[PDB]
Amino acid sequence: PVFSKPMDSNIRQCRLKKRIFAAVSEGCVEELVELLVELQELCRRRHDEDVPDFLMHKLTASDTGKTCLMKALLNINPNTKEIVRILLAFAEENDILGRFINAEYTEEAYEGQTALNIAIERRQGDIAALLIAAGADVNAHAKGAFFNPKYQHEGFYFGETPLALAACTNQPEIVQLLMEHEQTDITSRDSRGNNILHALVTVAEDFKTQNDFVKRMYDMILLRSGNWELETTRNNDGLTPLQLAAKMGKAEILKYILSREIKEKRLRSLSRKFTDWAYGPVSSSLYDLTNVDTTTDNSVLEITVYNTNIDNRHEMLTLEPLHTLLHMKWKKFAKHMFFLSFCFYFFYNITLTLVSYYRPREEEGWLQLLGRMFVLIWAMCISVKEGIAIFLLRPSDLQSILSDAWFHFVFFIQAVLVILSVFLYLFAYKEYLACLVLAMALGWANMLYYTRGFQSMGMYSVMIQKVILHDVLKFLFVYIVFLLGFGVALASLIEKCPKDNKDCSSYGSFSDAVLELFKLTIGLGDLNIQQNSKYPILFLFLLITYVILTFVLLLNMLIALMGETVENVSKESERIWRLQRARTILEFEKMLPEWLRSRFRMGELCKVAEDDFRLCLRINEVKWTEWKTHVSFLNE
Amino acid sequence: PVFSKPMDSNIRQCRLKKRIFAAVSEGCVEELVELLVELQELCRRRHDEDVPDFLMHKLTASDTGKTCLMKALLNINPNTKEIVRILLAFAEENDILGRFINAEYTEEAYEGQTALNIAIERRQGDIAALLIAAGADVNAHAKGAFFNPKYQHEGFYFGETPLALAACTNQPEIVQLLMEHEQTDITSRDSRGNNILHALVTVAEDFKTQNDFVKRMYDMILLRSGNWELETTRNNDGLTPLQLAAKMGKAEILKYILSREIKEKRLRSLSRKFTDWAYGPVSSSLYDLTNVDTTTDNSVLEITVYNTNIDNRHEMLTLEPLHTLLHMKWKKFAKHMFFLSFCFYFFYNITLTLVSYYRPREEEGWLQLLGRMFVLIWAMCISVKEGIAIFLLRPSDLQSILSDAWFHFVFFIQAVLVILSVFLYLFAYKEYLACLVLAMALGWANMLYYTRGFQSMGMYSVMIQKVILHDVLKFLFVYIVFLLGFGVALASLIEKCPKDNKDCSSYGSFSDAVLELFKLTIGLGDLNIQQNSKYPILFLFLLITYVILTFVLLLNMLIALMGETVENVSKESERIWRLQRARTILEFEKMLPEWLRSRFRMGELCKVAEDDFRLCLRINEVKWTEWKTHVSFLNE
Ligand SMILES: CCCCCCCC/C=C/CCCCCCCC(=O)O[C@@H](COC(=O)CCCCCCCCCCCCCCC)COP(=O)([O-])OCC[N+](C)(C)C
Ligand SMILES: CCCCCCCC/C=C/CCCCCCCC(=O)O[C@@H](COC(=O)CCCCCCCCCCCCCCC)COP(=O)([O-])OCC[N+](C)(C)C
Ligand SMILES: CCCCCCCC/C=C/CCCCCCCC(=O)O[C@@H](COC(=O)CCCCCCCCCCCCCCC)COP(=O)([O-])OCC[N+](C)(C)C
Ligand SMILES: CCCCCCCC/C=C/CCCCCCCC(=O)O[C@@H](COC(=O)CCCCCCCCCCCCCCC)COP(=O)([O-])OCC[N+](C)(C)C
Ligand SMILES: CCCCCCCC/C=C/CCCCCCCC(=O)O[C@@H](COC(=O)CCCCCCCCCCCCCCC)COP(=O)([O-])OCC[N+](C)(C)C
Ligand SMILES: CCCCCCCC/C=C/CCCCCCCC(=O)O[C@@H](COC(=O)CCCCCCCCCCCCCCC)COP(=O)([O-])OCC[N+](C)(C)C
Ligand SMILES: CCCCCCCC/C=C\CCCCCCCC(=O)O[C@@H](COC(=O)CCCCCCCCCCCCCCC)COP(=O)([O-])OCC[N+](C)(C)C
Ligand SMILES: CCCCCCCC/C=C\CCCCCCCC(=O)O[C@@H](COC(=O)CCCCCCCCCCCCCCC)COP(=O)([O-])OCC[N+](C)(C)C
Ligand SMILES: CCCCCCCC/C=C\CCCCCCCC(=O)O[C@@H](COC(=O)CCCCCCCCCCCCCCC)COP(=O)([O-])OCC[N+](C)(C)C
Ligand SMILES: CCCCCCCC/C=C\CCCCCCCC(=O)O[C@@H](COC(=O)CCCCCCCCCCCCCCC)COP(=O)([O-])OCC[N+](C)(C)C
Ligand SMILES: CCCCC/C=C\C/C=C\C/C=C/C/C=C\CCCC(=O)O
Ligand SMILES: CCCCC/C=C\C/C=C\C/C=C/C/C=C\CCCC(=O)O
Ligand SMILES: NCCOB(c1ccccc1)c1ccccc1
Ligand SMILES: NCCOB(c1ccccc1)c1ccccc1
Ligand SMILES: NCCOB(c1ccccc1)c1ccccc1
Ligand SMILES: NCCOB(c1ccccc1)c1ccccc1
Ligand code: NA
């Protein structure tokens, strides 16, 4: 990144004020005392009306706003605490201690950063305790391009508050010192709208390491708060800390929140998992479904399934209510809607076939009327439905067209070519055969959409798409190099044939020469040596050189590259069809009306505590492997 | 190796002097005292004019120059220190202690080795302290074929000085004893021109192990020197210890020197990295660019990119100023010069194509004149530019023609065949078509040079070259064995055909028989059994035997060997295009004039200290992963 002005500067890029910053940096105590006396006497020699203002302009930098207190804290030495006790005592007789401890940068990239923001970051618990006990602001919002970047490489976002700075830098002794302070606003929201619990989700990691202080900071702040105000708070985008963990793909944080159970009464009401009974490996629990089920707009189940930015959707959709809601919707409507979508579309491809095969060749019942009117209606049903999904779609397709958004185009292109064949055949035109045949060939080719979501057949549609997009299209630029180079080369040697006998040279034009050289590449060629040219040996040299390069080397090079794609999909094949069915379920739920979706709703009302009635889900879990390993070491 | 004379010898390959060497070896003290009295009395029985000379010829070997003091130190026993104290006291009454402790080998392979060179190597800190306190030379240069070899298997190079012997054999207690000695010349240069810091680079290793004493010896000697005299010293080849680490490929040493930062004032001026400010994971530093940027002749960036001898160029070009200078040159001129080199060469291949396809067949505008004159100029621009690069190139091509120096020939051969086609077409000749077509086919084939340096397309040009050079050409000697063996075999059975009907046997000659047997190998053949010979079954046996060997076994054996090459390049594919672009940048910088290269220069003048103004580079680094692991264990 770049900021065009440093935070601290001690190297110059090629007199009372400049010596004070050169005294608080190295740690010269006896020099700093002699310099402050020279500035204490320099207040009254010309005026006594402006004492509190003139004392501040000689201790602050006029370009950044950095004070002499900030300069001592940016440069940590073992003589640091002695400098702070002198500078805070110097503002006592001048009565300027109120504005000296609450100063901030006036520069646009570090605006709002105070001396308390530096002392907590340098791990100075004794110095930060002296500032708060003197009048430092515990609610100072450090804005700016450095503290509020646009990406995670152009600064450092922690939450803009001193409570979020100690929480993100693993310092719980300062968090306990700030939460006991009665002027600290815990539920404060920064420029992003994030509170103390949104900012911990942002700095969290995606997987489980050895030390997880973010989960420890999440539990410590939430239980000492003792309310739901931090959890129901939404951002400027309208996201809770539960929904933010699903958006950014933090599976360890999303697992902890969504099965949080507190056994202690006076603290039990802050739970989302409620175990009813347990007997060995069998447990029965109640799970909160407040923002999880798809009854609100931006629900957690809708985020995780449609989150193409992240890599761990299979880890997050295996979690504790998310796998059961996804399974119960399949056994109620989504298996029925997938079977009928197969049946109405397989009947649609047969009717396209039997009107394309039995077309009126030269001369130009109730079941025949039932067939052709079904073609005109079902093609308009797809072109409206798939046309909305393309319009409601963003142009950054590198992550959505993996297996998902590729089918939204080919069902739409096939539906338009059926409709375009109607306008051509009826009016006056003969180009209907060019549109009806290509729609029928693409119509049968779209039957591989119904192989998706199954353990045995789900990986075949991914193998076809990933070979075309990642192996074949990047290999056309290697092969057209040799197809167009040798194509003009062999066509230039062919002499103009004497008048008759058009089968005297197959390479007699550039359009001819590309055809046979494509046949030598795939192996349907002919090494003809008749070939009436003035250079028979030179034609025979470039013809065999083409066969060795394309057929022997470049053809088997592509097969070795396509074979690496097939084995990579086959290793991930158990994770593919589980994510294919998960998107198929939620698209079928959006096709349902409101009166029918209300019958399909899961959940029952519970009595958690006094004035607490939330929507639950009873999930009977049995864990044999986790039980046998648990019992074994209690009696080793 | 071989030296034809040993250092120490105790085994004979099938009388006062020979008993002394047989006394200092085993450790006989009471025998050695009785032998020295017999030699003390043998000085005066025939002359008293030559006492200091005659006392030395009976204690030294006349063939090697080895003394009795060296013989006791080569044979370490627990009775070693008692022998040294007697022999050094024996030279006191004879007043020959000055030449007895400073003696050396007169043999050509061990010349200059003294008793101090042996005592430090055998780990004798007490014996080496007694020699220096008696008058031993601390600046004795041990030359010779053993101590100055030509390769790293024909001797032991350490630096030829006793200070470099204790530094390379991990003995810092003797290094501290030598650097406090006021006659020790630290900045001494041996026969190679190496000083104390060049010799540590030579004995260093390429990667990071558990114990790195070479980096510890580099830091200990440099900080106690306290000057830049050891760093600015160049060899006989003109290399600093910074440039020697880039030449020999020591990435651990080159990383330590190029980000050396000393926080301590009185020692800060020996730094090359200067951290300006740090706030969490974000750091801003200034890097020294004295011999790093390409403004001097033998710069570190020019060495590492063009160092085909080493295997770790990707590890060294990732380092701390080397990755930023390589990235800033791409975003200023090298991306523009690569795009226009694509555009002027793609226009050049079209104009060659449209004059080769539309040639005057039988009978023999301003845009047509603009095209053909562009061919005559652009072919002369390549033939001059690529002709210099072949002339300035060494004949040891096994490491430069991997992906790099192969393109310097094929752009040159293509440019000459365009020029050769002009002299043939204009004068009187008809062989212009044999040169224009082969230049046009090779001209389109050189378009894969512009796929280099990209993450998606950079590995394809390496896969084509490595399959030809390492799989195909070593398999021709396997296949011509079977092509020439069966080719004469099947042509010898073919009887001379009765007069007419030339299509009676396709194997009627050796030139004919190689053609169809090449077609059976690739799979375009015919198992014809008509074949008018006197041995129809014996012809049919050798024909099917050829198909099973070549098409079934030897063809798929090559495909299995080519497939191992493709998967090895595909695993290294992220390291290939980063090294392809790095050579493309520095070749474009050499094409720039001096006035335009001065505008593209990076760096600003800094004030490091008093009388210290060097060229810097501000690099804003952010390290999220290295910060989250660092904070986690400080508050575990
Ligand atoms: C303009 C357009 C408008 C469109 C109108 C639509 C909009 C309005 C829609 C309204 C619909 C209303 C909702 C549906 C409610 C029905 C309830 C039901 O029975 O569902 C059931 C399915 O029932 C079945 O019979 C499934 C049959 C087997 C399917 C096999 C999948 C393969 C499909 C072909 C692929 C071949 C692959 C080969 C290669 C290609 C649910 O499943 P289950 O059986 O209950 O689960 C068993 C568990 N249990 C019994 C314990 C509970
Ligand atoms: C997944 C998808 C896989 C498959 C998709 C692949 C699809 C590929 C399909 C290919 C089929 C090709 C059909 C050709 C049709 C005729 C063309 C023509 O007119 O040529 C004419 C000139 O011929 C020349 O001289 C060629 C010169 C072209 C210049 C090349 C620049 C662009 C190439 C960029 C590449 C470099 C990039 C480098 C990057 C590394 C010859 O004309 P004619 O034939 O003799 O006509 C007879 C005239 N008559 C009819 C009146 C008698
Ligand atoms: C890359 C891996 C390499 C190894 C693996 C190989 C497999 C992959 C390789 C793929 C490379 C593709 C090479 C195709 C060769 C075309 C031949 C040709 O020129 O056509 C004809 C020209 O016809 C025309 O005049 C109009 C052009 C129509 C050509 C359409 C062909 C398919 C296009 C793309 C299909 C997309 C499919 C996508 C499926 C995923 C032949 O000419 P003619 O009619 O005989 O001459 C008439 C005479 N005249 C001169 C008087 C005019
Ligand atoms: C090793 C892997 C094995 C398995 C994989 C296989 C792939 C790799 C294998 C490679 C092996 C190569 C075998 C080629 C077969 C030659 C056929 C021949 O003899 O030509 C002709 C002779 O014509 C002549 O008389 C002049 C010679 C021209 C030959 C040029 C062929 C290409 C040369 C090298 C190209 C370099 C390309 C390099 C690309 C990287 C045929 O003879 P005829 O004209 O029909 O007879 C005339 C009649 N007469 C008897 C009266 C005279
Ligand atoms: C006799 C012979 C004499 C020869 C005369 C020459 C000698 C004298 C020469 C003198 C030249 C002087 C130096 C150049 C100064 C220009 C400045 C510039 O804009 O550079 C810029 C290029 O900007 C572009 O225009 C790049 C366009 C895209 C290139 C894509 C690469 C693919 C190229 C084809 C591959 C196809 C592969 C397909 C398969 C093959 C630098 O990049 P950038 O944009 O700045 O980077 C963005 C960063 N920034 C904007 C934030 C800063
Ligand atoms: C990457 C590159 C890949 C591709 C490149 C590969 C390129 C290969 C290309 C190959 C094409 C070959 C074309 C042949 C041209 C004619 C030759 C000839 O005249 O033969 C004659 C004798 O025939 C014999 O008897 C052969 C004996 C040769 C001795 C071999 C020793 C050296 C081989 C060392 C090997 C062992 C080493 C062992 C180590 C393991 C027959 O002549 P004719 O045919 O009857 O002519 C008709 C005469 N007339 C015209 C007047 C009528
Ligand atoms: C998986 C769930 C299944 C979903 C529903 C699927 C069920 C679909 C079932 C029926 C769909 C058809 C209804 C469309 C009505 C119009 C038909 C038409 O075009 O007329 C044709 C009549 O038909 C024939 O005679 C064709 C005979 C070959 C059909 C092959 C059987 C396979 C498809 C069928 C069975 C598939 C069974 C699938 C499994 C049940 C014209 O034929 P003609 O007599 O020659 O007329 C003369 C025309 N001429 C003058 C130009 C020559
Ligand atoms: C891949 C794209 C580039 C293709 C190669 C381009 C590079 C070439 C670079 C330099 C070549 C320069 C010399 C050739 C010019 C004269 C040729 C000639 O006149 O033909 C002669 C022989 O015909 C032949 O068989 C010639 C063989 C071609 C030479 C290829 C070099 C070997 C490289 C192999 C590597 C394999 C290729 C690369 C694989 C890695 C004439 O025979 P004729 O026809 O019977 O005519 C009779 C009339 N006349 C005698 C009066 C004339
Ligand atoms: C990526 C950056 C691009 C860099 C610049 C690339 C731009 C290059 C643009 C133009 C290059 C041409 C300039 C050379 C001028 C001489 C041409 C010539 O020989 O005359 C030919 C005229 O031309 C034709 O009529 C040929 C038509 C087929 C061309 C196919 C288009 C692809 C290449 C072009 C477009 C590529 C576009 C690429 C993308 C922009 C001869 O044809 P004729 O009428 O039959 O004459 C009769 C002769 N006869 C009597 C013997 C038969
Ligand atoms: C690889 C390079 C070397 C190739 C093998 C060399 C080694 C051979 C070593 C020893 C062979 C010694 C005996 C052969 C001599 C007489 C043959 C004969 O006369 O033909 C007879 C039959 O023709 C046949 O089919 C015979 C089979 C060929 C013999 C191969 C041995 C089996 C090895 C298998 C291993 C596979 C090979 C190796 C694969 C690993 C006659 O039939 P005719 O033709 O119709 O003529 C009729 C007229 N007449 C009856 C009057 C005659
Ligand atoms: C507006 C039309 C533009 C031109 C049309 C371009 C693309 C659509 C046409 C074909 C694309 C798909 C072809 C089907 C072939 C293989 C995929 C099998 C289905 C699967 O993946 O399992
Ligand atoms: C003086 C001439 C001597 C004879 C010529 C010998 C060799 C040069 C000719 C051809 C070599 C290159 C051919 C191109 C074919 C495949 C490589 C693709 C480009 C790449 O590598 O990606
Ligand atoms: N057979 C249980 C596999 O789990 B399922 C699953 C697991 C992880 C991610 C997505 C889904 C599942 C499959 C179909 C319907 C509901 C859930
Ligand atoms: N919207 C018109 C057809 O939509 B359906 C559909 C079309 C293509 C892919 C998937 C579904 C459909 C959905 C449920 C039952 C029957 C058909
Ligand atoms: N995109 C960062 C990859 O690093 B680059 C790189 C890394 C190691 C070796 C060589 C280069 C790089 C790539 C292009 C220009 C400059 C540097
Ligand atoms: N020297 C004549 C052609 O050189 B250029 C060139 C040609 C082939 C490969 C690499 C470079 C060139 C360089 C920059 C811009 C345009 C062309
Ligand atoms: Na394999």
Side-chain angles (χ1 to χ4, degrees), chain A residues 14 121-122 152 203 211 492 535, chain B residues 278 280 430 605 628 632 636:
Chain A
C14 295
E121 193 269 330
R122 298 291 183 184
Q152 201 180 6
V203 301
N211 193 2
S492 296
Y535 293 98
Chain B
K430 302 285 102 174
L605 186 64
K628 294 294 292 296
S632 295
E636 180 69 28

Side-chain angles (χ1 to χ4, degrees), chain A residues 1-2 6-14 110 113 117 121-123 146-147 152-153 155-158 165 168-173 203-204 211 213 216 470-471 474-475 477-478 481-482 484-485 488-489 491-496 509-510 520 523 525-527 535 538 540 542 544 547-548 551-554 556-557 560-561 564, chain B residues 265 268 274-282 284 286 353 356-357 359 361-362 430-434 437-438 440-441 444-448 451 455-457 460 463-464 467-468 472 515 518-519 522-524 555 558-559 562-563 566-568 570 604-608 613 616 618 620-622 624 627-628 631-636:
Chain A
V2 64
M7 184 184 288
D8 196 3
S9 179
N10 296 115
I11 298 168
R12 299 279 79 80
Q13 296 297 109
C14 295
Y110 297 103
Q113 184 180 4
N117 206 168
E121 193 269 330
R122 298 291 183 184
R123 193 178 292 274
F146 180 74
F147 299 105
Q152 201 180 6
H153 60 88
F156 177 68
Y157 180 74
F158 58 90
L165 197 277
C168 294
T169 60
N170 199 1
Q171 290 174 353
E173 291 86 4
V203 301
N211 193 2
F213 64 97
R216 292 182 291 173
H470 295 285
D471 290 330
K474 290 191 285 185
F475 196 75
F477 294 98
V478 182
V481 161
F482 294 101
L484 192 146
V488 189
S492 296
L493 278 46
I494 298 298
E495 183 65 29
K496 182 67 181 294
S509 179
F510 175 70
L520 270 304
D526 194 2
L527 278 175
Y535 293 98
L538 195 275
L540 189 274
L542 274 73
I544 294 173
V547 176
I548 299 169
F551 177 74
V552 177
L553 270 71
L554 267 69
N556 296 115
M557 189 181 291
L561 289 173
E564 294 177 355
Chain B
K265 187 179 180 180
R268 187 176 174 86
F274 295 98
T275 301
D276 198 1
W277 61 270
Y279 187 82
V282 178
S284 179
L286 293 173
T353 302
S356 178
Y357 184 74
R359 62 100 177 267
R361 298 290 181 183
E362 293 179 354
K430 302 285 102 174
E431 290 86 3
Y432 64 96
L433 188 67
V437 167
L438 272 68
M440 182 267 292
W444 287 104
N446 292 323
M447 294 299 291
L448 297 175
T451 62
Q455 186 178 2
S456 65
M457 296 297 290
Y460 289 102
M463 287 180 183
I464 297 170
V467 164
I468 294 170
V472 175
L515 189 280
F518 178 71
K519 290 171 71 175
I522 59 174
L524 295 176
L555 184 63
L558 181 63
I559 299 168
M562 291 185 288
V566 174
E567 62 94 21
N568 286 320
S570 178
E604 291 179 353
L605 186 64
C606 296
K607 190 262 182 182
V608 174
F613 295 97
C616 299
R618 186 178 295 275
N620 297 114
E621 293 180 353
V622 56
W624 291 98
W627 182 68
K628 294 294 292 296
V631 178
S632 295
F633 66 96
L634 267 70
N635 210 163
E636 180 69 28

Side-chain angles (χ1 to χ4, degrees), chain A residues 275-287:
Chain A
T275 301
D276 197 1
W277 61 270
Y279 187 82
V282 178
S283 178
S284 179
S285 297
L286 293 173
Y287 292 89

Side-chain angles (χ1 to χ4, degrees), chain A residues 478 481-482 486 545 549 553-554, chain B residues 403 406-407 409-410 412-414 416-417 438 441-442 444-449 451-452 460-466 468:
Chain A
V478 182
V481 161
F482 294 101
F486 287 95
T545 306
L549 289 174
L553 270 71
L554 267 69
Chain B
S403 67
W406 183 257
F407 290 100
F409 292 102
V410 296
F412 181 74
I413 295 169
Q414 191 269 331
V416 172
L417 291 173
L438 272 68
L442 186 62
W444 287 104
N446 292 323
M447 294 299 291
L448 297 175
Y449 179 74
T451 62
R452 297 175 69 251
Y460 289 102
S461 66
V462 180
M463 287 180 183
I464 297 170
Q465 294 176 357
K466 192 177 178 181
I468 294 170

Side-chain angles (χ1 to χ4, degrees), chain A residues 445-480:
Chain A
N446 292 323
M447 294 300 291
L448 297 175
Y449 179 74
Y450 295 99
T451 62
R452 297 175 69 251
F454 294 100
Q455 186 178 2
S456 65
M457 296 297 290
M459 75 291 291
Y460 289 102
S461 66
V462 180
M463 287 180 183
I464 298 170
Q465 294 176 357
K466 192 177 178 181
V467 164
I468 294 170
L469 294 175
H470 295 285
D471 290 330
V472 175
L473 266 68
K474 290 191 285 185
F475 196 75
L476 275 44
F477 294 98
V478 182
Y479 177 70
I480 300 300

Side-chain angles (χ1 to χ4, degrees), chain A residues 192-220:
Chain A
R192 291 183 181 179
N194 292 322
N195 59 2
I196 190 66
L197 295 183
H198 290 94
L200 292 173
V201 173
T202 304
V203 301
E205 60 186 1
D206 292 331
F207 63 97
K208 293 182 183 292
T209 58
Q210 183 179 2
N211 193 2
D212 48 354
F213 64 97
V214 175
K215 187 185 287 184
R216 292 182 291 173
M217 289 294 174
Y218 184 81
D219 184 74
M220 184 180 72

